[PDB]
Design a protein around this ligand. Structure first.
Ligand SMILES: N[C@@H](CC(=O)O)C(=O)O
Ligand SMILES: N[C@@H](CC(=O)O)C(=O)O
Ligand SMILES: [Mg+2]
Ligand SMILES: [Mg+2]
Ligand SMILES: [Mg+2]
Lengths: 496, 499
């Protein structure tokens, strides 16, 4: 058979081509910024890093390409990609065409259906439209059940799992059959996740592995070693808790460019606020910052800030309020001044905002602390004038980028700290799609030991029953997904 | 101390600028401060950098108005300003002036075909003027001396003054004639407006600086003299007054290392025939067609300008395009005052073929373009034809869809040129273009060499467009980059100045 390895081909070419799935949630799927993410993609990344160390090629490139259940094996055999980790069952029939790593997940094949409907088990599918994803194990099982039991099902074959779920969600099928965890994943992305139930006696139990070409023991050994190390280091259980037991967030990217004319910077970015009906409210941000002082600043090369925030409520606070936890890291440039020295400890923060939106006047006061070493903010905001006339999430970006974590190799690009203590003016236009606009002007500076953000906000042209003045936005940030899925006994055994 | 002493101490020169003195010192639609006088301001800054041996001197532009320019100069809030300030004896008591950079007369702007033919026609009428200007003094003086009973509306800056006139809330706007021509150029309908009236005065503009600083005055006067005799002053006049003024677009690029590619985002503003603007938000992702190594960039941007024209011998629906693109956003380092194989494919002139098939709200169409690209100069020249008859969308909405491998990457940035590095195998370019209050284009293109020709083959799908919106309604001007075209003669006094 083969005398060489895909590892030798990778080393020659300088790139590893990795297949990935498009809608295997939360394992290998596109997030709303088209990043390929998930539990299996974490294994894929670990394997890629293991290939880089094994080949001593620290600058190896990666090229992720999309595959489907239908085309994964033909594209593997003709060399279109080198391996994939996503949601592929290891079985005997497939071992005739491909090789598999050791198992990374174990599932059972079940049904997703509307809560409170007639579908309790597979027997309820008689004479009904049932959706299943083309090219999958469940498609084979569902057709076989339909034929062997003469159930008169109308089996709809959809191109990928999100399409299958949206067939169910729109009423064109009474149930979706698939791996139970993938049903839970599509449910998490639904308009109303809590309307959907997993039901039915399992038709099978399956084990997922990474797929690679046959006759490559060196590459499979590197994968199996990597999987073994992920387990015994505790990372496998930590990745499970990450994807299945905590909110899954999508980072925002604040794109920064120098504005040398003004000795400052500009930025642009988009926020997508979740709407209660399952849609999204786009908020387009334009930003300009100029230093208050007339001394030197750091004028950055282009880069971006990667941001995630968590909103919560203080159970002992009766005023209208928001508790905020925020994490920000600078990126976009590949690998002590006075201003930067001001941020080496924990710095108290004060925020004051005076707002007028469509004539509705309000004020907000916030206090907390920031830890730029860790890119971390913790703040509590109160509406001091009574009820806030807009949703708290629409004010998050307005309510101190000097607390971003700049990596050591990027510290010469940190405009925000360099303007301290005298500070900077931050101005934004925030354009809400199909609705009004906020215009903001803030001064961010030190007053004594405290970092103060004092803002004026003016909002115009809002729709009184739109998503903002109508209070139709969910109290969250970064478009969370929250899985509802039990750690099974089989998975517990896998982790030993 | 002196102004240079302050600049040297701080490492920053603080430059006052006007906000609406068109086309001398004004904000363009990307908030950049531009104009004929700002070209002088930049020349002065560069002379200060050279004099102080501080190539990394920083610049801080701060806005000033006709009302606050002198007090902010006096208390040191800024160091100098080049804009539109008259030099006169009264102001010399408060400030020093450079040698003259422009000469104007004070006149009126009014609606073409109206009753305002000269200053006498203003009797009993509303007249607008900018607060704190020479014209405001002259207009009030004329009012009282000739008992004209004008209602003088005093607006905060020249754009506000003009929009008072444009919106019918005054019958005329008095100002420096060239500033009237500048505000006209930005109007909803520039050709509706006429400059009339016997000049009330002739004025000379200079750059303002603090009094009793002869060395800083000499640096500015020396720079202004060099601009004249080097011919730059006449070239700047031609640039600002006899050629279209464009705004550049910035294409903001970030790496997408997962896909061995890049993403980009940027905004295009299309001029609408009624004077409004149609926003087109661009999201972009590129991936290499080949599986071999590429250049993965740090964040940077492409600075783009385009000129659309018509071929007078072409009877088909068509667009002639000239485009210039330069990469920017990574500073040339103090210590430095081919990176891919594909880069070598662009050292000379490369022929280009573009093929687009479109479907917008069910209206199908095809476009074919041919021309050539010169990446050494960041320059493209193409002619496009609609091969299916009439184009069902405006040509400007297709410009961004219809080869960023022809961008000029400065030498210090060549390691960030993903586009050329993916050749000859090429790349896939996908976009979502969202037209504000209207529909969306989704595009997928392959850009690659086919033999010696760089080929861009595109599929475009448009949905949710309004049939009477700006796109399907064909309400967009045939231009790009939001041009302004001055209508202003070179006077004999300006010719004298250029000697
Ligand atoms: N695990 C199933 C479904 C999938 O791949 O998404 C299969 O291997 O066919
Ligand atoms: N040139 C006039 C108007 C202006 O400054 O814009 C003045 O000096 O007041
Ligand atoms: Mg939801
Ligand atoms: Mg009199
Ligand atoms: Mg126009």
């Amino acid at each position: 058979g083969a005398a060489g390895s895909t590892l030798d081909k990778i080393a020659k070419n300088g790139v590893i081509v990795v297949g990935h799935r498009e809608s295997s949630v939360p394992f290998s799927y596109y997030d709303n910024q088209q990043k390929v993410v998930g539990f299996s993609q974490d294994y894929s990344n670990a394997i890629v890093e293991a290939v880089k160390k094994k080949l001593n090629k620290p600058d190896l490139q990666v090229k992720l390409i999309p595959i489907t259940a239908q085309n994964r094996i033909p594209l593997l055999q003709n060399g279109t990609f080198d391996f994939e980790c996503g949601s592929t069952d290891n079985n005997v029939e497939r071992q005739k065409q491909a090789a598999f790593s050791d198992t990374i997940f174990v599932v059972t094949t079940r049904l997703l259906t509307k809560k409170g409907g007639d579908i309790k088990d597979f027997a309820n599918l008689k004479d009904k439209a049932v959706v299943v994803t083309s090219g999958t194990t469940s498609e084979v099982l569902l057709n076989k059940l339909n034929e062997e039991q003469k159930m008169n099902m109308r089996i709809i074959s959809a191109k990928d799992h999100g399409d299958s779920f949206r067939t169910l969600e729109s009423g064109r099928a009474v149930a979706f059959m698939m791996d139970d965890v993938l049903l839970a994943g599509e449910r998490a992305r639904a308009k109303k996740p809590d309307n959907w139930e997993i039901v039915g006696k399992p038709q099978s139990q399956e084990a997922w592995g990474c797929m690679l070409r046959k006759d490559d023991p060196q590459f499979k050994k590197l994968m199996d070693d990597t999987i073994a190390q992920v387990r015994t280091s505790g990372e496998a259980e930590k990745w499970f808790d990450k994807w299945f037991k905590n909110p899954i967030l999508v980072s925002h990217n604040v794109y920064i460019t120098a504005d040398k004319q003004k000795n400052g910077i500009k930025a642009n970015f988009k926020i997508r606020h979740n709407v209660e009906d399952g849609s999204v409210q786009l908020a387009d941000h334009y930003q300009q910052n100029t230093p208050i002082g007339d001394g030197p600043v750091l004028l950055p090369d282009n880069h971006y800030l990667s941001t995630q925030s968590v909103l919560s409520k203080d159970p002992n606070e009766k005023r209208d309020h928001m508790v905020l936890l925020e994490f920000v890291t600078a990126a976009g440039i590949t690998l002590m001044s006075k201003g930067e020295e001001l941020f080496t400890g924990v710095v108290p923060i004060l925020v004051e905002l005076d707002g007028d939106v469509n004539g509705h006047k309000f004020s907000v006061r916030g206090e907390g602390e920031g830890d730029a070493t860790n890119g971390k903010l913790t703040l509590k905001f109160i509406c001091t004038t009574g009820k806030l006339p807009v949703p708290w999430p629409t004010l998050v970006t307005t309510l101190v980028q000097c607390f971003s974590r700049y990596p050591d190799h990027m510290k010469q690009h940190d405009f925000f700290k360099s303007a301290m203590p005298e500070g900077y003016v931050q101005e934004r236009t925030i354009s809400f799609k199909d609705d009004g606009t906020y215009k903001t002007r803030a001064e961010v500076k030190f007053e004594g030991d405290t970092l103060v953000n004092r803002i004026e906000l003016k909002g115009i042209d809002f729709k009184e029953d739109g998503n903002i003045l109508g209070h139709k936005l969910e109290y969250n940030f970064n478009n969370p997904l929250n899985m509802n899925f039990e750690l099974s006994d089989e998975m517990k055994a896998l982790f030993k």
